[PDB]
Structure 1
Amino acid sequence: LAPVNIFKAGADEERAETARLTSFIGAIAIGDLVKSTLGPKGMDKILLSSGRDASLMVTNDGATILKNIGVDNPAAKVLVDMSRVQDDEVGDGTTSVTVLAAELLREAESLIAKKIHPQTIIAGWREATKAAREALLSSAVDHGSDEVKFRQDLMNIAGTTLSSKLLTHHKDHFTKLAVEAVLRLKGSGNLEAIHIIKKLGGSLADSYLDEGFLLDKKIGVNQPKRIENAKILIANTGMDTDKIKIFGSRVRVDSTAKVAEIEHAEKEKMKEKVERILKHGINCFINRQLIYNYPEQLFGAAGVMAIEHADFAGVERLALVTGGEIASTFDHPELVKLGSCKLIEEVMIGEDKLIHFSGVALGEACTIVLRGATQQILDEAERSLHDALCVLAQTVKDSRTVYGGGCSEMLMAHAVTQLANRTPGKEAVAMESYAKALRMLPTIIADNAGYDSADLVAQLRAAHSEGNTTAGLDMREGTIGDMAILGITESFQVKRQVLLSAAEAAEVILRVDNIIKAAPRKRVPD
Structure 2
Amino acid sequence: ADEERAETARLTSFIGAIAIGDLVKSTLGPKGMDKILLSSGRDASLMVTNDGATILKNIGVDNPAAKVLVDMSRVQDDEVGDGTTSVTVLAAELLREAESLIAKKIHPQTIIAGWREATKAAREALLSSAVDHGSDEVKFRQDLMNIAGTTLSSKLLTHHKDHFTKLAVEAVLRLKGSGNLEAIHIIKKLGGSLADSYLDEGFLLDKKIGVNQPKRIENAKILIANTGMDTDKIKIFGSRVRVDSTAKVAEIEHAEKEKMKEKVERILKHGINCFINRQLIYNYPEQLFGAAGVMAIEHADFAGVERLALVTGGEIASTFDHPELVKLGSCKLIEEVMIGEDKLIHFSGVALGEACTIVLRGATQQILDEAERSLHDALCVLAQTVKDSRTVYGGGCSEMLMAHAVTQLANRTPGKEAVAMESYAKALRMLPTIIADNAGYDSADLVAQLRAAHSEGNTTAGLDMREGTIGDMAILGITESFQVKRQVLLSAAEAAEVILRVDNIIKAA
TM-based fold match above 0.5: yes
Question: CA distance change for structure 1 residues 59 and 321 in 2, over 3 Å: closer, same or farther?
Answer: farther
For residue 496 of structure 1, report the CA deviation from its aligned partner.
1.8
For residue 174 of structure 1, report the CA deviation from its aligned partner.
2.2
> Conserved in 2, the CA contact under 8 Å of 1:199 and 1:370?
yes
Question: CA distance change for structure 1 residues 418 and 308 in 2, over 3 Å: closer, same or farther?
Answer: same
> Conserved in 1, the CA contact under 8 Å of 2:200 and 2:346?
no
Secondary structure of 2:47 counterpart: strand
For residue 23 of structure 1, report the CA deviation from its aligned partner.
1.1
For residue 417 of structure 1, report the CA deviation from its aligned partner.
1.3
Question: CA distance change for structure 1 residues 492 and 115 in 2, over 3 Å: closer, same or farther?
Answer: same
Question: CA distance change for structure 1 residues 260 and 338 in 2, over 3 Å: closer, same or farther?
Answer: same
For residue 343 of structure 1, report the CA deviation from its aligned partner.
5.1
Moved more, 373-382 or 318-327: 318-327
For residue 137 of structure 1, report the CA deviation from its aligned partner.
1.7
Question: CA distance change for structure 1 residues 170 and 107 in 2, over 3 Å: closer, same or farther?
Answer: same
> Conserved in 1, the CA contact under 8 Å of 2:93 and 2:431?
no
> Conserved in 2, the CA contact under 8 Å of 1:405 and 1:488?
yes
Structure 2: give runs of 5+ residues left out of the alignment.
none
Aligned equivalents of 2:243, 2:409: Cα separation in 1: 93
Residue-by-residue CA offset, 1:53-112 (whole Å, 9 max, x unaligned): 987755433333323331111111001111111222211211121111101111111211
> Conserved in 2, the CA contact under 8 Å of 1:406 and 1:442?
yes
> Conserved in 1, the CA contact under 8 Å of 2:187 and 2:358?
yes
> Conserved in 1, the CA contact under 8 Å of 2:17 and 2:92?
yes
Moved more, 246-255 or 502-511: 246-255
> Conserved in 2, the CA contact under 8 Å of 1:320 and 1:364?
no
Question: CA distance change for structure 1 residues 239 and 476 in 2, over 3 Å: closer, same or farther?
Answer: same
Question: CA distance change for structure 1 residues 275 and 441 in 2, over 3 Å: closer, same or farther?
Answer: same
Match of 2:462 in 1: 472
Aligned equivalents of 1:428, 1:250: Cα separation in 2: 77
Residue-by-residue CA offset, 1:172-206 (whole Å, 9 max, x unaligned): 43222121122344544331443333344554333
For residue 31 of structure 1, report the CA deviation from its aligned partner.
0.2
Structure 1: give runs of 5+ residues left out of the alignment.
1-10, 520-526
For residue 276 of structure 1, report the CA deviation from its aligned partner.
3.3
For residue 132 of structure 1, report the CA deviation from its aligned partner.
1.4
Question: CA distance change for structure 1 residues 240 and 186 in 2, over 3 Å: closer, same or farther?
Answer: farther
Secondary structure of 2:204 counterpart: strand
Aligned equivalents of 1:274, 1:264: Cα separation in 2: 17
Aligned equivalents of 2:239, 2:38: Cα separation in 1: 56
Question: CA distance change for structure 1 residues 56 and 182 in 2, over 3 Å: closer, same or farther?
Answer: farther
> Conserved in 1, the CA contact under 8 Å of 2:217 and 2:333?
yes
Residue-by-residue CA offset, 1:110-153 (whole Å, 9 max, x unaligned): 21111222222222222322321222222322343432322222
For residue 465 of structure 1, report the CA deviation from its aligned partner.
0.9
Question: CA distance change for structure 1 residues 82 and 317 in 2, over 3 Å: closer, same or farther?
Answer: same
For residue 416 of structure 1, report the CA deviation from its aligned partner.
1.4
Match of 1:29 in 2: 19
Match of 1:524 in 2: none
Relative to the length of structure 2, the TM-score reads 0.87
Moved more, 89-98 or 50-59: 50-59
For residue 239 of structure 1, report the CA deviation from its aligned partner.
2.6
Residue-by-residue CA offset, 1:289-335 (whole Å, 9 max, x unaligned): 23233323433554533112324422233334444444479999997
Aligned equivalents of 1:31, 1:364: Cα separation in 2: 40
Q: 1:359 aligns with which of 346, 349, 353?
A: 349
Residue-by-residue CA offset, 1:241-281 (whole Å, 9 max, x unaligned): 43655799868999999975775465334423322321333
Match of 2:231 in 1: 241
For residue 218 of structure 1, report the CA deviation from its aligned partner.
4.7
Q: Does 1:262 align with 2:252?
A: yes
Q: Taking every aligned residue pair, what percent have the same amino acid on both sides?
A: 100
Paired residues, what number? 509
Q: Does 1:307 align with 2:297?
A: yes
Question: CA distance change for structure 1 residues 200 and 289 in 2, over 3 Å: closer, same or farther?
Answer: closer
Aligned equivalents of 2:169, 2:136: Cα separation in 1: 16
For residue 219 of structure 1, report the CA deviation from its aligned partner.
4.0
Question: CA distance change for structure 1 residues 289 and 53 in 2, over 3 Å: closer, same or farther?
Answer: farther
Structure of greater Rg: 1
Aligned equivalents of 1:290, 1:153: Cα separation in 2: 45
Moved more, 24-33 or 175-184: 175-184
> Conserved in 1, the CA contact under 8 Å of 2:26 and 2:35?
no
> Conserved in 2, the CA contact under 8 Å of 1:405 and 1:483?
no
Q: 1:397 aligns with which of 366, 384, 387?
A: 387
Aligned equivalents of 1:187, 1:487: Cα separation in 2: 23
Moved more, 443-452 or 273-282: 273-282
Residue-by-residue CA offset, 1:476-526 (whole Å, 9 max, x unaligned): 33222231363543333321221121111111111232321114xxxxxxx
Aligned equivalents of 1:276, 1:249: Cα separation in 2: 19
Aligned equivalents of 1:150, 1:282: Cα separation in 2: 40
Aligned equivalents of 1:476, 1:259: Cα separation in 2: 77
> Conserved in 1, the CA contact under 8 Å of 2:224 and 2:276?
yes
Aligned equivalents of 1:484, 1:428: Cα separation in 2: 31
Aligned equivalents of 1:329, 1:472: Cα separation in 2: 58
Aligned equivalents of 1:54, 1:391: Cα separation in 2: 34
Secondary structure of 2:307 counterpart: helix
Residue-by-residue CA offset, 1:381-437 (whole Å, 9 max, x unaligned): 111111210111011112332222111111111111112223445544322111111
For residue 28 of structure 1, report the CA deviation from its aligned partner.
0.7
> Conserved in 1, the CA contact under 8 Å of 2:178 and 2:386?
no
Aligned equivalents of 1:202, 1:222: Cα separation in 2: 26
Question: CA distance change for structure 1 residues 244 and 488 in 2, over 3 Å: closer, same or farther?
Answer: closer
Aligned equivalents of 2:101, 2:224: Cα separation in 1: 66
For residue 36 of structure 1, report the CA deviation from its aligned partner.
0.8
> Conserved in 2, the CA contact under 8 Å of 1:220 and 1:307?
no
Aligned equivalents of 2:330, 2:210: Cα separation in 1: 21
Moved more, 198-207 or 279-288: 198-207
> Conserved in 1, the CA contact under 8 Å of 2:175 and 2:386?
no
Aligned equivalents of 2:440, 2:390: Cα separation in 1: 32
